[PDB]
Amino acid sequence: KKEWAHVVDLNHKIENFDELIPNPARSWPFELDTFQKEAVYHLEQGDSVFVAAHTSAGKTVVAEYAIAMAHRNMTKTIYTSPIKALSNQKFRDFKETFVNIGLITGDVQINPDANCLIMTTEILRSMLYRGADLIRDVEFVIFDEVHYVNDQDRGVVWEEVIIMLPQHVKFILLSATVPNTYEFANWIGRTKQKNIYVISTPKRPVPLEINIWAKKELIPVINQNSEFLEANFRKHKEILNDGPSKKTWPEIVNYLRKRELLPMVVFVFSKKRCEEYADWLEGINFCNNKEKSQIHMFIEKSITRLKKEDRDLPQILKTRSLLERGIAVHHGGLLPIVKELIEILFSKGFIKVLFATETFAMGLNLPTRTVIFSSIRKHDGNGLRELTPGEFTQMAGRAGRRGLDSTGTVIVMAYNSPLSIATFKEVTMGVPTRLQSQFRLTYNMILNLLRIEALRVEEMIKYSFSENAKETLQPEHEKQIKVLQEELQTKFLELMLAYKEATVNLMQEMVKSPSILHILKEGRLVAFRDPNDCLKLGFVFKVSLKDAVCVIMTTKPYKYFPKADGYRRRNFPKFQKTDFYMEEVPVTIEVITKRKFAPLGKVIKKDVAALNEFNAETNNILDGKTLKEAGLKIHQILLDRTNIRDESQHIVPKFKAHVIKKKIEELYHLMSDSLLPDYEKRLAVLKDTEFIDQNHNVLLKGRVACEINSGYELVLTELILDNFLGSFEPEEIVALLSVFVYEGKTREEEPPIVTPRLAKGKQRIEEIYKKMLCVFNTHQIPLTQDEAEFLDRKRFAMMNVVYEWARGLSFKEIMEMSPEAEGTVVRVITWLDEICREVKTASIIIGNSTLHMKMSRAQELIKRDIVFAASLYL
């Protein structure tokens, strides 16, 4: 009866809305869309909202409203998103929109006494665990980019956060259009006992047009009404009938320029190729003198902080070169400050051509007039594969600027060969991506909750999305089993069914080895099952292993077993005949008879001769005899089958009962398997390695691990627990620690480790990790590919860089010896600061003040220059 999540009908309207709101906490130059009105309304009622709105609709408006309320009730509104890189920006967007707002990061903290705070989800979780005091004064928590999914991002923890939030906190979840919003809104509302209204939109306010660029021509293939244009696509194919060349970009750039479809963002899934393509625009310029000067001034003003040695970095000079001509690239290889320059200049209208990797499309709020896909295929750790509809929608959706563009232009590049239609339709018009739960158990979480209170973990698991999902399913499967249990209420089968499965198995097995084409030579009379599973007989005519389908000349369906005379007589009487037809049949054929027909093609023509022959043969085959049958896998399979072997109008019921048993048995397991198993395993793991004792008390070791929130808490704890690091220099320690924050995917050969101790340290960590893996294996706990291949990658490749950096080398010299691009160097080194902080705290717990001192020293050594430059957004 009681519902906590309420779906707001799209057909619903608020004509008297302007009257319902007496004193709107905020107003805008424009007129709010119905969904925004819904949002504001339900917010003012004192309820929660889950807004899943198309790209270009204006979700931020709901965020600003909320905030406003916080400034009207002396309450606090915390804004959160999983994307840390986008904290500084959002913090600047609100400052320029509203007026005290703060910013909470790991090291930097600005204006905490504000009625609004910007922070990542992790920081919020952290504050929750901490039990911060300001949370008692928080009324609204905004969860932005709820649809954000990233496997390599450990900060997507809004579920844990929502579970942990106190009862007096109301929610505002912002998301792209997803199909399963109600699920999560219902979990939230039910689990939190909160009225939450699910709000969405019918379509994109700024409609997209999807085009293909082929042979210097722009061809529409999906119109504003999302209709696929077959003729045009075929046209592209025909025109063409294989990647960017030197003339590619100048040509399309020039084409779009004459037609004023700029600025353009070109998505390129490769940093190198971004830069290459950008370089291919040599001699093209979009900036007049004043613009060049403004840009120069902005850059000069922005980097004046840095030392001269950093201002003159090659990447900076090259970037300036591009920027002063209205061109840029955007990718993870760039120094943050450079990224920021590019972003700020792009948002202000100084950049007309931007080549960007996928990241640019996710967080950043920088829409463009035109979006181009250099390719709709991207390589992920798995390899090369087509983009998913969600990704394509995410990138393509950037192409419409509400208020500036009538429409958003999206272009897919074709080069020398046509794009496949299935691929293209799957990528551009595939089923929209669903919200998935990101909630996982970690040792850190378990140790912390366990340290807090005995059954906190169980409680956390009870209130998770998975559990609630299981709860939602339970009754459904109950009714299904009720119908089945009642439906039924109103050895032969085992061996037989097994025999069927065995024959199917063997058949599937024979479909791999070409040798089959010898057994299924044109004319091989066989008894097979049609789609309706009716036994029939026919001669083989074609064998396409590529499609694994055989064309047969067919005996009407019979609505046996090799060498089963009596069994045949009793079970299988004479079959019926029917005009021969060519039927396509799947290999997975109940029996391959010894009978072979001497050309069918002549029977297909109905030549009197072949006709008579066929008639006689068929009549003969259908008249008398009973069917006779006739690698290493097929051998064993056949053996087992024969073992089972040695082992008409009445089998219907039994068969039905079997079907039932299968269904029910199936619906049973469907309620068996999920966090509790993992949890038990993890407890076992923590018990074996002594983070907790036999009674599940958290030991000192576990209290140390509680402080490491970076991913490899157990191994790191193990590393720092004793005094192996006793004779290491701060530089050496921070150098060695880089292994826990570097993917180690460099495609270059590792040079000699710069010091002996570092080599020893690598050895030590490797050993620790091996042991830990052994323990993971013992308790059959599933590993992520990273955990698994950890040692198979070059994770230690950054030790030298970090060492030399801690020694005082300039970034220039650092880069001259780095196996990774600037951005990654900065990523590693900036993460190491946090690592050092964690280790400091840990050392406090351990009582090792020397280690503490060293870590402080390391922080002091690495925390400098362009690597730690203040954000341009602040």
Ligand X SMILES: Nc1ncnc2c1ncn2[C@@H]1O[C@H](COP(=O)(O)OP(=O)(O)NP(=O)(O)O)[C@@H](O)[C@H]1O
Residue closer to ligand X by CB (options 58, 155) is: 58
Residue type, 290: K
Out of 17, 21, 60, 830, the residue judged to bind ligand X by CB under 6 A: 60
Residue closer to ligand X by CB (options 403, 808) is: 403
Our finding on whether 631 is near ligand X (CB under 6 A) is: no
Only segment of 58-66, 456-464, 804-812, 827-835 that touches ligand X (CB under 6 A): 58-66
Query: Taking the complex as a whole, how short is the minimal distance between the CB of residue 170 and ligand X, in angstroms?
Result: 21
Q: Which of residues 590-619 bind ligand X (CB under 6 A)?
A: none
Query: Taking the complex as a whole, how short is the minimal distance between the CB of residue 33 and ligand X, in angstroms?
Result: 5
Query: Taking the complex as a whole, how short is the minimal distance between the CB of residue 402 and ligand X, in angstroms?
Result: 4
Q: Which of residues 157-176 bind ligand X (CB under 6 A)?
A: 176
Our finding on whether 61 is near ligand X (CB under 6 A) is: yes
Q: Shortest CA distance to 360 belongs to which of 327, 332, 389?
A: 332
Report whether the peptide linkage leading into residue 751 is cis, meaning its omega lies within 30 degrees of zero: no
Task: Write b or e for each residue in 166-201: b if 16 or more Cβ atoms lie within 10 A of its Cβ, otherwise e.
Answer: eeebbbbbbbbbbeebbbbbbbbbbbbebbbbbbbb
Our finding on whether 30 is near ligand X (CB under 6 A) is: yes
Our finding on whether 82 is near ligand X (CB under 6 A) is: no
Our finding on whether 358 is near ligand X (CB under 6 A) is: no
- In eight-state DSSP terms, residue 208 is E
Our finding on whether 365 is near ligand X (CB under 6 A) is: yes
Our finding on whether 53 is near ligand X (CB under 6 A) is: yes
Our finding on whether 702 is near ligand X (CB under 6 A) is: no
User: Per the structure block, which two tokens stand in for 611?
Assistant: 């006709």
Our finding on whether 412 is near ligand X (CB under 6 A) is: no
Our finding on whether 402 is near ligand X (CB under 6 A) is: yes
Our finding on whether 637 is near ligand X (CB under 6 A) is: no
Out of 34, 55, 77, 709, the residue judged to bind ligand X by CB under 6 A: 55
User: Per the structure block, which two tokens stand in for 408?
Assistant: 């958003």
Query: 690, 718 in Cβ contact below 8 A?
Result: no
**For residue 690, is it left (φ>0), alpha (ψ between -120 and 50) or beta?**
left
Binding-site residues from annotation? 53-60
Residue closer to ligand X by CB (options 51, 527) is: 51
Compute the residue count for the chain.
874
Which distant-in-sequence residues (6+ apart) come within 8 Å of 612 by Cβ?
A: none
Paired residues of 50 in beta bridges: 173, 198
Out of 33, 613, 617, 688, the residue judged to bind ligand X by CB under 6 A: 33
Our finding on whether 270 is near ligand X (CB under 6 A) is: no
Our finding on whether 58 is near ligand X (CB under 6 A) is: yes
Beta strands of 387-461 (E only): which ranges?
408-413
Query: 449, 456 in Cβ contact below 8 A?
Result: yes
Query: Taking the complex as a whole, how short is the minimal distance between the CB of residue 357 and ligand X, in angstroms?
Result: 17
Query: Taking the complex as a whole, how short is the minimal distance between the CB of residue 61 and ligand X, in angstroms?
Result: 5
Please give the size of the binding site for ligand X, defined by CB under 6 A: 16
Only segment of 27-35, 95-103, 105-113, 852-860 that touches ligand X (CB under 6 A): 27-35
Q: Shortest CA distance to 645 belongs to which of 500, 534, 536?
A: 500
Sheet holding 76-81, edge to edge: 5-7, 196-200, 48-52, 170-175, 138-143, 76-81, 116-120, 101-104, 109-110
CA angle 129, 134, 139 (to 5 degrees): 100
- Token match 């905030």: residue? 67
Only segment of 25-33, 414-422, 583-591, 810-818 that touches ligand X (CB under 6 A): 25-33
> Checking DSSP bridges between strand 76-81 and strand 116-120, what pairing results, if any?
parallel
Query: Taking the complex as a whole, how short is the minimal distance between the CB of residue 78 and ligand X, in angstroms?
Result: 19
Residue closer to ligand X by CB (options 35, 373) is: 35
Only segment of 30-38, 255-263, 711-719, 722-730 that touches ligand X (CB under 6 A): 30-38
- Token match 């192409």: residue? 399
Binding-site residues from annotation for ATP? 53-60
Cα 696 to its chain centre, rounded Å, is: 35
Our finding on whether 32 is near ligand X (CB under 6 A) is: yes
Residue closer to ligand X by CB (options 398, 827) is: 398
How many C-beta neighbours within 10 Å does residue 121 have?
Answer: 26
The residue whose Cβ lies closest to ligand X is 58
Query: Taking the complex as a whole, how short is the minimal distance between the CB of residue 80 and ligand X, in angstroms?
Result: 15
Out of 6, 37, 59, 170, the residue judged to bind ligand X by CB under 6 A: 59
Q: Which of residues 178-217 bind ligand X (CB under 6 A)?
A: none
CA pair distance 690, 696, nearest whole angstrom? 10
Our finding on whether 387 is near ligand X (CB under 6 A) is: no
Only segment of 55-63, 514-522, 575-583, 702-710 that touches ligand X (CB under 6 A): 55-63
Our finding on whether 68 is near ligand X (CB under 6 A) is: no
Our finding on whether 542 is near ligand X (CB under 6 A) is: no
Sheet holding 549-553, edge to edge: 582-586, 549-553, 535-544, 524-529, 591-596
* Residue 596 DSSP SS3: strand
Our finding on whether 801 is near ligand X (CB under 6 A) is: no
Report DSSP letters for 681-730, one per residue.
HHHHHHHHTTSB-TT-PBPHHHHHHTT--SS-HHHHHHHHHSSGGGG--H
Cα 508 to its chain centre, rounded Å, is: 33
Residue closer to ligand X by CB (options 58, 263) is: 58
- Token match 């809004």: residue? 158
Question: What are the residues binding ligand X (CB under 6 A)?
Answer: 30, 32-33, 36, 53, 55-61, 176, 365, 402-403
